[PDB]
Structure formats: C-alpha cells, structure tokens
C-alpha cells in the first residue's frame, strides 16, 4: 500500500495510519469532484466499456407525482425526500 | 475473350458477391463509397481545480 | 500460539485478521510471547520476518525483546535493535 | 521469510472440460519495437519460457 | 531515511522483491549500476536520481529464476499435442484445412 | 454524415495533431516515442 | 430488500484487507474489469448484436419493396452490394440506409 | 558627455542536446502507437501533453526532473521524480487525488511512482 521511497515509508503505526487516511481523503476528494461535475468525465474512450470508471448519479430524475419517482428515490436512499414524496 | 470465360467469370462474381453486371468503372464509385465508413472542455476542468484549491 | 498462527496461514484465512488495530494487537501479543518463550535465534528470525513487513512495533515489544536478549545473554545484538528502534 | 511461511496456497481451479481442444500448427509472434536491446531481452524471456 | 537495499541479504528471494513489472527504484535495486555519458574526467551518473535508468523498461521482474519459478507453476494449465501428429506430413493429412487469424497487442485504452 | 453522403452518391503536422512549431519542441525534448532526429 | 443488501455488503467487509502485492492488485482490477483480459482478443465486449454473416452478406431481402426490374433495381442492387462489403457497419445501420433510400424514392 | 567620449546548472535531460535522443538521451514517453502499423499516435500525444501539464500543476515546484510516461496494455505509469520539500502527507494526498482523477479521466488504470530526491541532480553547467 505504501511507497518504497525511504522518505515516504511510514516509520510508526500512527504515521502509517495517517498516510493511509490522507490517501483515502485524496481519493474521496477526487470522487467528490467527479460526481459534482460528471460532464467533464462522461467521454468514454476505453473498449470494452468500464462502468466502474464512470461518474455516479445520485439525484432523482423522475419529477412527476407518481409511484415510479418514489421507487427511484427509495433506490437512491433519500429518507427525508422519500417521506415527503409519500 | 471467349464467352465461356465471360459467363464463368460472372458466375464467380455471383458466388463471391461481386457485382455480376459489369457497370464500367465510373458508376462503380458508389460501391467504394458505401463499402467504407476537445481542448475547450479540458480547460474549465483546469479552472475548476483552481477554484477547489488543487491547481497551481 | 503457533497453532493459531498456523491456522491463520492456511489458504486465505489471513483476511480474517480485520482492521489495522486488530492486526497490530494480534501480532504484538504474538511477538511478545515469542520473546518471552522462544530461543533467542528463533525470536530474532521472527523479528526480522514480521517487523516492519507485518506491523510497526510498540516500545513495549522492544522492551520485551531487550529482556529476552538479556535472558539469553546475547547482549551484542543491542546496537542493531537500538538502530531499528531509532 | 525465514520462519513465517504460508502453510498452504490456493492453487487456481483448472477444470478438464469435455469439449475437444483446439490445435495450432504454427503460431507466429511478431514483436515490433523502437529498441533492439528490449527486443533481445524479450526474445530471451520468451524463448526460456517456451523451452520450459 | 536509509534505503532498504542495506537490509537485503545476499541470498534473498529476488522475485518477491519485484513480483511484477515495476519501474527502477534505486532504493529497492541493490546494485551499484551507473549509466550516463561521462563528463571530462568524470564518471557515469549514479543510480539515485537518474531519470535515464527510470526510462529503461527493466527486466528485473523477469529473471531466469523468476521465469523458471513462474512457468513451473503455469504447467498445470497446459495440454499435450497429439503424439500421432509427429510432423507436418500428417498434419496436412488428418487436418487438411488451415485457418489463419491474427490478434494485435498495442498500448492504449481501446 | 449519412444524410449528406446519400445525396452526394447520386452525383502542417496534421499527422500527429500538433502545431508545426510544437512538434519540433516536443521532438527535440525526446518527448515523442521513437521520433529521433537524423 | 435493503436489509439483505446491506447485510451482504457488511459481510463483504470481514474479508476486506489491503492489497498485499502487485499480483493481488492486478487480480483486483481484473475482477473490477479495469484491466484487459489476456490473451488479448481484439473483439472483446463486442458481439455486433449477435448478427450472423448471412445478415451482413445477403442484404437483398430488404429490396423487395423496390422496383423489381427497373433502373432503380440496378441502383439498389449496387447499393446493397456496397453495404454487404462494409465491415464497419452493423446490420441495423445497413437496413436503415436501405429504408432511407426506400422513403426517398417513395416521395419522388 | 560629448559623442566621441562615449565612442546555470543543468540536469541530464537539460544538459544533453536534442541530437542525442537515441545516442545519449532517451524518450520520456514510451508507447506503441507511433510504431509502424500502430494507430492512435496523436491521441497518445494529446494524453501526454495533458498529463504533463496536470502533473506539473498538481505538484508545483516539486518535480525535480521530467516525468516518464510509460504505457503497457491499458496501464498508464507516471514514473515521476520529486523533491523532499513537501510533507509526506501532502504527497500521499496528491498521489491519491491525481491517480483517481486520471483513472476517471482516461477510463484506464493510471498509476504513480513518485521518487523523492534530496535536491536537483545537476549533470553539468551551461
């Protein structure tokens, strides 16, 4: 998980945990910017298509008052808006 | 050219799928026609990274 | 302890160690037992094989290893362990 | 690893099917590169693997 | 911090150090290899910080011992050529038709 | 593409997609793969 | 329901350890589908809608609604010959080309 | 008064001239696309341009020397050489961010291989 470079090799368990958490935070920031602006990353170039590298959509698409929107929102796990929808 | 070579050739054309009727070559062009077939957006990505505090 | 570690080493059972905290606790206790009971050569071999590849040691583990060296009267190893702890 | 060794290892599952296997008379691998030394090293690697 | 090459024994298991294709790491390769056209009354550049050694597609992950130890484990995936087909003479007898097809390996997303 | 073709049927370093100045700049640095000047 | 899904997801965690070497990383990416399959198959993930060769090579069944012996028959026979020799197009694109020709001639 | 009275360190890549690209220097980026019969050379070059700009902007004043952009299969290894000036936590955060960003950028498994050095490795002086 860590780099072989001596300056970047962790020296203690606390330091190793700090490095791992920093890497995870960088990954989370990358995911946040990806999902906040999917348009910059929609362009797919790889054959075969890789679904795991495409941005994720979390916003409800169905707006009309129907059961289908409310099911979509259950699938998106939006509690407060789901009770509003019901 | 013996007519035997002629009809044997147009039979070969039917078997292999070439144009059986020899349509000269000028009108043979559409056979060739139908036989064949973003720095902008990348910059506002660079702008967005700047705003978030991750560029420059 | 050796039986438990052997069970751990069967196939993919190592995945059951759990988070980093559990791994550190498990290995620290295992190395403490090794230092307390194994012959000094075997303890040094385990020290080389486990640290730093498996875990980052606690100062208490170093104190236990120093005590084991004292009991074995292998005092000439003290400079190497000091350099490692540094 | 002087003492701590894996006790047993998960060999991958290779099942002998019933469908008959394909047979290749020849298999020509043409490797192209900008460097002759890389091609020589890769030739050594591939040849050793083929002999073994 | 000190390089980990100092801790590597002379009888180590090198394949475990480079299990897969990895770039040249001067803190991981225990060789005093030098490369670079020397300057007047100079020596070829040292490995630490050498971009030219970092530019080589090194075969450290493929050593003869590593190759043997890999292809010994890969034997389980192989089948045996039919011994009846001893030469091309019988190949052109029992299997008249030859089907040639090509695959291409480039580098890229597609 | 298809629509325009149908009616018709009845009847600089663009190789690398670089500006001609830039290709020199890249190739001198060794940046392009295999582009060695001779 | 959500209970079973989350139950399985938190079963996934008990054997969730960090990658231990490069081979495990390659295996993980291969399972995720990020890595290519080896040996390389240049037509991987592409099946052309399960089409057969007779659907690509014999496209004259779609010319039945056109004139059967006129000059339009000649032009359409040529057009289908051209389409049948196109390896870049799917059957659907060829048939919609034929349908566009049908409609254009029908208007005219 | 009157008219009649009046009348640098260089690294290895920097030091060597371009005509040693196949004699002394090498190629930073290594891909098959430019070979005979191989396609997508321009695509690879555009990716290289963006990748170098984005690395130099994501690691400002840190890269000691130019990158090495290797590609095997769909892999994209950026073997970069940086300094020891930034804190290791920042290096790890930037590595994670850039890896994820580029992997979702190109839809390919990008990777980084940072190599820290104490300072610029000067070859000679011009």
XYZ file of C-alpha atoms in Angstrom:
662
model
C 0.000 0.000 0.000
C 2.856 2.395 0.828
C 5.602 3.617 -1.483
C 9.085 2.100 -1.452
C 10.700 5.552 -1.330
C 12.507 5.834 2.049
C 11.250 9.377 2.691
C 7.659 8.183 2.132
C 7.927 4.874 4.007
C 5.962 5.195 7.276
C 8.050 4.826 10.426
C 5.318 4.165 13.017
C 1.838 2.681 13.183
C 0.382 6.143 13.801
C 2.309 7.547 10.828
C 1.216 4.642 8.621
C -2.415 5.191 9.610
C -2.074 8.925 8.937
C -0.649 8.258 5.470
C -3.437 5.787 4.687
C -6.112 8.238 5.838
C -4.547 11.045 3.789
C -4.561 8.835 0.689
C -8.193 7.917 1.362
C -9.113 11.592 1.791
C -7.478 12.408 -1.534
C -9.460 9.606 -3.155
C -12.667 10.930 -1.582
C -11.978 14.456 -2.844
C -11.388 13.021 -6.318
C -14.699 11.142 -6.127
C -16.483 14.298 -4.959
C -15.175 16.395 -7.846
C -16.003 13.551 -10.252
C -19.613 13.271 -9.084
C -20.071 17.046 -8.810
C -19.189 17.616 -12.496
C -19.904 14.406 -14.445
C -19.869 16.305 -17.751
C -16.075 16.691 -17.736
C -15.717 12.888 -17.467
C -18.645 11.468 -19.479
C -16.387 10.902 -22.517
C -15.642 7.176 -22.705
C -12.603 6.090 -24.732
C -11.943 2.543 -23.472
C -13.166 -0.561 -25.307
C -14.588 -2.584 -23.510
C -16.643 -0.046 -21.564
C -15.701 0.212 -17.883
C -18.775 1.082 -15.757
C -16.674 1.437 -12.589
C -14.821 4.465 -14.025
C -17.994 6.429 -14.955
C -19.382 9.121 -12.590
C -22.256 8.095 -10.325
C -25.613 9.902 -10.394
C -27.334 10.463 -7.039
C -30.057 12.965 -7.989
C -33.659 11.801 -8.639
C -34.534 12.018 -12.329
C -38.301 11.416 -12.106
C -40.080 14.611 -11.024
C -43.773 13.907 -11.664
C -46.045 12.804 -8.822
C -46.102 9.038 -9.355
C -45.061 5.811 -7.669
C -42.124 5.402 -10.061
C -40.361 8.539 -8.822
C -40.824 7.422 -5.225
C -39.376 3.985 -6.028
C -36.416 5.616 -7.790
C -35.852 7.698 -4.667
C -36.051 4.624 -2.439
C -33.334 3.155 -4.634
C -31.320 6.350 -4.079
C -31.921 6.028 -0.298
C -33.135 9.629 0.260
C -35.103 9.330 3.501
C -36.471 12.840 4.076
C -37.441 13.397 0.444
C -38.913 9.888 0.278
C -41.275 10.626 3.183
C -42.067 13.949 1.505
C -42.845 12.025 -1.691
C -45.172 9.600 0.094
C -12.262 -13.252 -74.608
C -14.251 -16.443 -75.068
C -17.878 -16.136 -73.994
C -17.196 -19.183 -71.826
C -14.719 -17.118 -69.811
C -17.366 -14.380 -69.680
C -20.154 -16.442 -68.142
C -17.776 -18.392 -65.905
C -16.494 -15.051 -64.586
C -19.992 -13.730 -63.942
C -20.781 -16.985 -62.115
C -17.682 -16.451 -59.970
C -18.986 -12.935 -59.326
C -22.333 -14.313 -58.154
C -20.654 -16.843 -55.855
C -18.199 -14.388 -54.259
C -20.676 -11.488 -54.199
C -19.040 -9.102 -56.668
C -21.232 -7.042 -58.988
C -22.404 -9.509 -61.636
C -23.306 -6.802 -64.158
C -20.048 -5.048 -65.166
C -21.107 -1.430 -64.657
C -17.953 0.028 -66.276
C -15.926 1.931 -63.609
C -17.303 5.494 -63.333
C -20.557 4.266 -61.759
C -18.550 1.703 -59.754
C -17.563 4.578 -57.424
C -20.623 4.310 -55.167
C -19.620 0.723 -54.381
C -16.452 2.217 -52.897
C -18.465 4.960 -51.181
C -20.747 2.514 -49.356
C -18.000 -0.058 -48.740
C -16.226 2.402 -46.426
C -17.488 4.457 -43.483
C -11.901 18.931 -27.292
C -9.364 21.332 -25.748
C -12.291 23.550 -24.699
C -13.817 21.317 -22.037
C -10.431 20.301 -20.663
C -9.677 23.921 -19.695
C -12.728 24.539 -17.467
C -11.621 21.365 -15.707
C -8.351 23.191 -15.080
C -10.336 26.221 -13.892
C -12.443 24.084 -11.551
C -9.343 22.528 -9.970
C -8.035 26.060 -9.383
C -11.198 27.099 -7.532
C -11.221 23.990 -5.327
C -7.638 24.775 -4.325
C -5.941 21.917 -6.184
C -4.298 23.680 -9.168
C -1.240 25.919 -9.219
C 0.142 -19.513 19.681
C 1.934 -21.421 16.923
C -1.208 -23.480 16.294
C -3.298 -20.306 15.990
C -0.774 -18.739 13.615
C -0.705 -21.921 11.539
C -4.491 -21.816 11.313
C -4.120 -18.206 10.175
C -1.636 -19.264 7.485
C -3.979 -21.840 5.878
C -5.122 -20.588 2.490
C -6.763 -17.164 2.681
C -7.564 -17.192 6.413
C -5.268 -14.174 6.886
C -8.098 -12.000 5.535
C -9.822 -12.627 8.888
C -7.280 -10.528 10.808
C -9.553 -7.490 10.449
C -8.665 -3.788 10.623
C -5.172 -2.476 11.261
C -5.792 -2.149 15.008
C -6.665 -5.838 15.348
C -3.653 -6.826 13.243
C -1.338 -4.758 15.435
C -2.790 -6.194 18.650
C -2.581 -9.780 17.373
C 0.986 -9.511 16.109
C 2.211 -7.567 19.153
C 0.902 -10.247 21.506
C 2.347 -12.997 19.291
C 5.789 -11.372 19.245
C 5.653 -10.735 22.992
C 5.011 -14.443 23.563
C 7.832 -15.359 21.165
C 10.233 -13.051 23.000
C 9.149 -14.478 26.353
C 9.488 -18.166 25.390
C 11.352 -18.902 22.141
C 15.088 -19.403 21.817
C 16.812 -16.131 21.013
C 17.722 -17.141 17.454
C 14.099 -18.012 16.656
C 12.937 -14.754 18.244
C 15.388 -12.804 16.079
C 14.227 -14.668 12.969
C 10.600 -13.846 13.803
C 11.588 -10.224 14.482
C 13.216 -9.977 11.057
C 10.316 -11.681 9.272
C 7.499 -9.752 10.991
C 8.917 -6.237 11.541
C 8.420 -3.890 9.630
C 6.796 -6.017 6.920
C 3.872 -7.210 9.070
C 3.442 -4.478 11.696
C 5.067 -1.480 13.335
C 6.282 -2.476 16.819
C 5.305 -0.883 20.117
C 8.002 0.317 22.520
C 6.729 -2.367 24.900
C 7.588 -5.034 22.322
C 11.109 -3.602 22.106
C 11.382 -3.720 25.905
C 10.263 -7.361 25.835
C 12.802 -8.180 23.115
C 15.545 -6.472 25.135
C 14.530 -8.551 28.160
C 14.661 -11.702 26.026
C 18.141 -10.752 24.804
C 19.188 -10.184 28.423
C 17.854 -13.610 29.427
C 19.736 -15.170 26.502
C 22.848 -13.118 27.408
C 23.018 -12.079 23.731
C 23.943 -8.506 24.636
C 25.935 -7.940 21.426
C 22.695 -7.511 19.430
C 21.692 -4.358 21.375
C 23.188 -1.892 18.835
C 21.134 -3.363 15.977
C 17.857 -3.259 17.913
C 18.664 0.291 19.016
C 19.233 1.370 15.415
C 15.983 -0.326 14.395
C 14.023 1.368 17.194
C 15.547 4.723 16.244
C 10.728 -15.307 5.011
C 12.914 -17.488 7.233
C 10.199 -18.903 9.535
C 6.861 -17.246 8.709
C 5.762 -19.069 5.546
C 2.292 -19.703 4.055
C 1.174 -23.129 5.232
C -0.966 -23.871 2.158
C -1.730 -21.932 -1.019
C -4.894 -21.743 -3.124
C -3.923 -23.263 -6.449
C -6.220 -21.896 -9.187
C -9.068 -24.103 -10.378
C -8.283 -25.633 -13.781
C -11.091 -27.990 -14.807
C -10.668 -30.518 -17.620
C -13.673 -29.893 -19.857
C -15.177 -32.414 -22.273
C -15.041 -30.229 -25.391
C -12.034 -31.135 -27.581
C -9.140 -28.702 -27.577
C -8.066 -26.536 -30.495
C -4.864 -27.498 -32.325
C -2.452 -24.892 -33.724
C 0.064 -25.952 -36.359
C 2.030 -22.692 -36.117
C 1.888 -19.539 -34.014
C 3.964 -16.601 -35.255
C 4.549 -13.855 -32.681
C 5.984 -10.760 -34.377
C 7.150 -8.194 -31.808
C 7.875 -4.653 -33.009
C 9.898 -2.075 -31.108
C 11.974 1.079 -31.299
C 14.833 -0.555 -29.347
C 16.889 -3.623 -30.229
C 18.018 -4.317 -26.651
C 14.437 -4.555 -25.375
C 13.614 -6.938 -28.217
C 16.674 -9.070 -27.414
C 15.739 -9.259 -23.724
C 12.137 -10.123 -24.587
C 13.405 -12.765 -27.014
C 15.458 -14.329 -24.221
C 12.450 -14.270 -21.877
C 10.032 -15.755 -24.418
C 12.490 -18.430 -25.547
C 13.219 -19.536 -21.980
C 9.500 -19.748 -21.215
C 8.895 -21.718 -24.420
C 11.647 -24.230 -23.658
C 10.356 -24.764 -20.129
C 15.716 7.711 5.739
C 18.161 4.966 4.728
C 17.486 2.822 1.647
C 16.151 -0.673 2.244
C 18.828 -2.180 -0.020
C 21.063 -2.142 3.072
C 18.746 -4.678 4.759
C 18.637 -7.128 1.824
C 20.675 -10.298 2.283
C 22.970 -11.695 -0.409
C 20.828 -14.872 -0.569
C 17.410 -13.207 -0.710
C 14.485 -14.304 -2.889
C 14.704 -11.622 -5.565
C 11.363 -12.478 -7.281
C 9.488 -11.429 -4.130
C 11.209 -8.024 -4.229
C 9.922 -7.410 -7.795
C 6.847 -9.644 -8.172
C 5.570 -7.736 -11.231
C 6.700 -5.175 -13.783
C 7.702 -2.144 -11.719
C 9.917 0.850 -12.535
C 13.537 1.120 -11.488
C 13.613 2.006 -7.783
C 17.183 2.913 -6.699
C 16.144 2.399 -3.060
C 14.932 -1.130 -3.933
C 17.503 -2.333 -6.502
C 20.648 -3.490 -4.575
C 23.043 -2.850 -7.473
C 25.625 -0.030 -7.849
C 24.662 0.374 -11.506
C 25.687 3.608 -13.236
C 24.546 4.989 -16.569
C 25.210 8.197 -18.493
C 27.822 9.591 -20.887
C 30.602 10.741 -18.521
C 31.857 14.319 -18.444
C 35.543 15.107 -18.938
C 37.442 13.446 -16.084
C 34.063 12.272 -14.819
C 32.115 9.087 -14.186
C 28.710 7.857 -15.372
C 25.907 9.192 -13.195
C 24.850 7.253 -10.109
C 21.521 5.448 -9.894
C 19.912 7.705 -7.257
C 18.019 10.376 -9.181
C 18.922 9.010 -12.621
C 15.997 9.609 -14.982
C 17.716 7.563 -17.702
C 17.614 4.384 -15.606
C 13.987 5.246 -14.837
C 13.342 5.385 -18.601
C 14.527 1.815 -19.301
C 11.920 -0.987 -19.463
C 13.853 -3.037 -16.926
C 13.516 -6.830 -16.829
C 14.157 -7.072 -13.084
C 10.759 -8.711 -12.549
C 11.757 -11.341 -15.159
C 14.933 -13.098 -14.038
C 15.851 -16.665 -15.060
C 14.989 -17.938 -11.581
C 11.741 -15.953 -11.638
C 10.901 -17.190 -15.142
C 11.511 -20.810 -14.144
C 9.558 -20.464 -10.902
C 6.635 -18.929 -12.828
C 6.493 -21.361 -15.761
C 6.805 -24.307 -13.369
C 3.549 -23.201 -11.718
C 1.947 -22.460 -15.101
C 2.387 -26.064 -16.307
C -0.967 -27.077 -14.798
C -2.798 -25.048 -17.472
C -1.311 -26.881 -20.476
C -2.483 -29.774 -22.642
C -0.417 -32.180 -24.737
C -0.006 -32.095 -28.502
C -1.417 -35.326 -30.026
C 1.597 -37.613 -30.374
C 0.129 -39.086 -33.572
C 0.864 -35.776 -35.333
C 4.646 -36.137 -35.408
C 5.347 -33.826 -38.366
C 3.644 -31.567 -40.897
C 3.208 -34.540 -43.250
C 0.478 -35.976 -41.011
C -0.873 -32.514 -40.151
C -1.665 -31.947 -43.842
C -3.168 -35.469 -43.976
C -5.507 -35.629 -40.968
C -6.359 -31.885 -40.827
C -6.412 -30.576 -44.415
C -7.792 -27.075 -43.759
C -5.613 -24.380 -42.187
C -7.330 -21.329 -40.673
C -5.071 -18.307 -40.115
C -6.257 -15.474 -37.865
C -4.358 -12.589 -36.271
C -4.523 -10.706 -32.970
C -2.870 -7.346 -32.276
C -1.490 -6.033 -28.970
C -0.987 -2.266 -28.879
C -0.972 0.078 -25.852
C -3.927 2.328 -25.103
C -7.477 2.464 -23.756
C -9.011 0.735 -26.802
C -22.757 12.249 -42.201
C -25.100 9.632 -43.645
C -27.613 12.213 -44.884
C -25.053 14.340 -46.733
C -23.330 11.282 -48.222
C -26.568 9.948 -49.719
C -27.187 12.946 -51.989
C -23.517 13.047 -52.995
C -23.629 9.382 -54.031
C -26.292 10.123 -56.654
C -23.903 12.641 -58.229
C 1.365 21.367 -41.354
C 1.704 18.394 -38.986
C -1.854 17.103 -39.024
C -0.372 13.589 -38.841
C 0.234 13.922 -35.081
C -2.386 16.641 -34.391
C 0.231 19.167 -33.258
C 1.143 22.683 -34.280
C 4.140 22.562 -36.598
C 6.205 24.629 -34.153
C 5.170 22.477 -31.184
C 6.099 19.188 -32.863
C 9.684 20.430 -33.129
C 9.619 21.466 -29.467
C 8.274 18.085 -28.360
C 10.526 16.014 -30.623
C 13.705 17.852 -29.600
C 13.000 17.043 -25.947
C 12.662 13.359 -26.853
C 9.039 13.507 -25.727
C 7.550 11.772 -28.769
C 8.027 7.995 -28.786
C 10.572 6.930 -31.389
C 10.911 10.341 -33.060
C 14.711 10.551 -33.228
C 16.076 13.326 -35.432
C 18.540 12.233 -38.113
C -34.740 -5.605 0.484
C -32.295 -3.025 1.831
C -31.684 -5.262 4.848
C -30.317 -8.135 2.750
C -28.277 -5.789 0.541
C -26.593 -4.073 3.489
C -26.141 -7.435 5.220
C -24.223 -8.753 2.213
C -22.252 -5.510 1.958
C -21.081 -5.791 5.582
C -20.294 -9.466 5.043
C -18.004 -8.171 2.294
C -16.065 -6.235 4.951
C -14.849 -9.102 7.169
C -12.512 -10.230 4.355
C -11.656 -6.662 3.273
C -7.882 -6.378 3.660
C -5.452 -4.074 1.842
C -3.719 -5.427 -1.238
C -0.584 -7.339 -0.247
C 1.407 -7.212 -3.514
C 1.216 -6.331 -7.206
C -0.328 -9.598 -8.366
C -3.251 -9.104 -5.985
C -3.706 -5.580 -7.350
C -3.813 -6.891 -10.918
C -6.308 -9.571 -9.863
C -8.496 -6.982 -8.125
C -8.517 -4.678 -11.153
C -9.231 -7.626 -13.460
C -12.216 -8.582 -11.303
C -13.364 -4.952 -11.359
C -12.936 -5.062 -15.144
C -10.442 -2.188 -15.323
C -7.737 -4.403 -16.859
C -7.816 -6.064 -20.259
C -8.175 -9.829 -20.496
C -5.174 -11.868 -21.604
C -4.573 -13.221 -24.211
C -5.816 -10.089 -25.972
C -8.969 -10.560 -28.041
C -9.329 -7.509 -30.274
C -13.127 -8.026 -30.447
C -13.708 -8.238 -26.691
C -17.008 -6.907 -25.395
C -18.329 -6.590 -28.965
C -20.761 -9.108 -30.468
C -22.495 -7.000 -33.162
C -25.938 -7.732 -31.696
C -25.488 -11.463 -32.286
C -25.701 -10.943 -36.039
C -24.769 -13.727 -38.454
C -22.831 -13.471 -41.699
C -25.926 -14.127 -43.822
C -27.452 -10.988 -42.283
C -24.414 -8.953 -43.426
C -23.609 -10.562 -46.778
C -27.163 -11.185 -48.104
C -28.996 -7.856 -47.765
C -31.138 -8.199 -50.913
C -34.224 -9.308 -48.955
C -34.712 -5.647 -47.969
C -35.025 -4.606 -51.642
C -38.311 -6.454 -52.223
C -40.446 -3.302 -51.896
C -38.370 -1.505 -54.555
C -38.956 -1.899 -58.315
C -38.011 -5.429 -59.350
C -36.674 -4.911 -62.893
C -36.192 -1.158 -63.450
C -33.108 1.056 -63.190
C -33.946 1.520 -59.510
C -33.417 -2.232 -59.150
C -29.950 -1.781 -60.655
C -29.071 1.119 -58.357
C -30.367 -0.667 -55.242
C -28.617 -3.926 -56.146
C -25.413 -1.917 -56.389
C -26.159 -0.153 -53.083
C -26.755 -3.428 -51.243
C -23.577 -4.851 -52.789
C -21.731 -1.853 -51.364
C -23.319 -2.254 -47.933
C -22.622 -6.002 -47.784
C -18.903 -5.207 -48.229
C -18.896 -2.756 -45.298
C -17.282 -4.298 -42.175
C -17.637 -1.093 -40.115
C -21.463 -1.037 -40.092
C -23.956 -3.117 -38.149
C -26.976 -4.737 -39.778
C -29.257 -2.062 -38.311
C -27.343 0.769 -39.992
C -27.413 -1.038 -43.346
C -31.161 -1.656 -43.160
C -31.865 1.954 -42.168
C -29.780 3.110 -45.145
C -31.988 0.888 -47.309
C -35.101 2.317 -45.634
C -33.950 5.892 -46.259
C -33.495 5.039 -49.933
C -36.972 3.478 -49.934
C -38.548 6.587 -48.414
C -36.669 8.991 -50.693
C -37.774 7.117 -53.809
C -41.325 6.838 -52.455
C -41.530 10.622 -52.097
C -40.099 11.035 -55.603
C 29.220 63.608 -22.425
C 30.283 64.514 -25.988
C 29.643 61.769 -28.571
C 33.317 60.819 -29.188
C 33.969 60.120 -25.491
C 31.193 57.516 -25.479
C 32.581 56.055 -28.716
C 23.370 27.835 -14.749
C 23.004 24.207 -13.580
C 21.500 21.664 -15.971
C 20.163 18.165 -15.352
C 20.865 15.192 -17.622
C 17.901 15.898 -19.903
C 18.673 19.627 -19.938
C 22.429 19.211 -20.414
C 22.356 16.952 -23.473
C 21.267 18.388 -26.828
C 18.321 17.000 -28.837
C 20.579 15.147 -31.286
C 21.370 12.622 -28.508
C 17.761 11.409 -28.166
C 18.838 7.947 -29.394
C 22.560 8.256 -28.600
C 22.784 9.575 -25.025
C 19.295 10.752 -24.022
C 16.135 8.647 -24.195
C 12.387 9.038 -24.644
C 10.306 10.227 -21.701
C 7.061 8.743 -23.034
C 7.023 5.132 -24.261
C 4.057 3.826 -26.263
C 3.476 1.519 -29.224
C 1.096 3.893 -31.021
C 3.846 5.572 -33.032
C 5.293 2.282 -34.356
C 4.723 1.173 -37.952
C 1.155 -0.045 -38.398
C 0.090 1.034 -34.919
C -2.632 3.660 -34.576
C -3.659 6.473 -32.230
C -0.268 8.216 -32.038
C -1.887 11.660 -31.910
C -4.285 10.521 -29.183
C -1.364 9.285 -27.093
C 0.490 12.567 -27.637
C -2.519 14.635 -26.546
C -2.837 12.476 -23.439
C 0.867 13.026 -22.748
C 0.505 16.805 -23.101
C -2.404 16.991 -20.678
C -0.785 14.529 -18.285
C 2.430 16.532 -18.054
C 0.551 19.794 -17.552
C -1.645 18.233 -14.855
C 1.301 16.655 -13.017
C 3.300 19.887 -13.097
C 0.247 21.761 -11.810
C -0.667 19.169 -9.178
C 2.949 19.036 -7.929
C 4.129 22.650 -8.343
C 7.836 23.141 -7.748
C 8.103 19.529 -6.542
C 9.077 17.542 -9.646
C 12.876 17.519 -9.710
C 13.013 16.306 -13.328
C 10.574 15.486 -16.120
C 8.130 12.593 -15.874
C 8.384 9.186 -17.520
C 5.033 8.268 -19.106
C 5.001 4.517 -19.651
C 2.048 2.538 -21.021
C 1.632 -1.254 -21.093
C -1.701 -2.585 -22.276
C -4.184 -0.057 -20.924
C -1.925 0.807 -17.975
C -0.535 4.348 -17.560
C 2.505 4.586 -15.276
C 3.679 8.090 -14.400
C 7.182 7.488 -13.037
C 7.842 10.949 -11.648
C 10.797 12.249 -9.643
C 10.004 14.874 -7.000
C 11.790 16.637 -4.136
C 11.604 16.112 -0.355
C 10.292 19.619 0.346
C 6.577 18.912 0.806
C 5.317 16.908 3.757
C 4.702 13.187 3.102
C 1.009 13.588 3.951
C 0.593 16.111 1.135
C 2.427 13.771 -1.243
C 0.116 10.881 -0.347
C -2.995 13.052 -0.696
C -1.866 14.344 -4.091
C -0.974 10.832 -5.265
C -4.427 9.538 -4.376
C -6.203 12.538 -5.888
C -4.253 12.508 -9.151
C -4.497 8.728 -9.541
C -8.278 8.746 -9.131
C -8.704 11.858 -11.281
C -6.664 10.433 -14.156
C -8.243 6.973 -13.898
C -11.678 8.554 -14.325
C -10.230 10.957 -16.908
C -8.950 8.334 -19.345
C -11.078 5.361 -18.221
C -7.835 3.415 -17.827
C -5.857 2.173 -14.793
C -3.453 5.069 -14.185
C -0.730 4.796 -11.536
C 2.010 6.955 -9.981
C 5.566 6.001 -8.954
C 6.907 9.100 -7.165
C 10.658 9.017 -6.454
C 11.796 11.640 -3.949
C 15.323 13.064 -4.197
C 17.055 15.480 -1.775
C 17.609 18.128 -4.467
C 18.026 18.686 -8.190
C 20.561 16.231 -9.599
C 22.696 18.593 -11.670
C 24.651 16.974 -14.501
C 26.801 19.923 -15.623
C 26.609 23.708 -16.045
C 25.844 25.647 -19.233
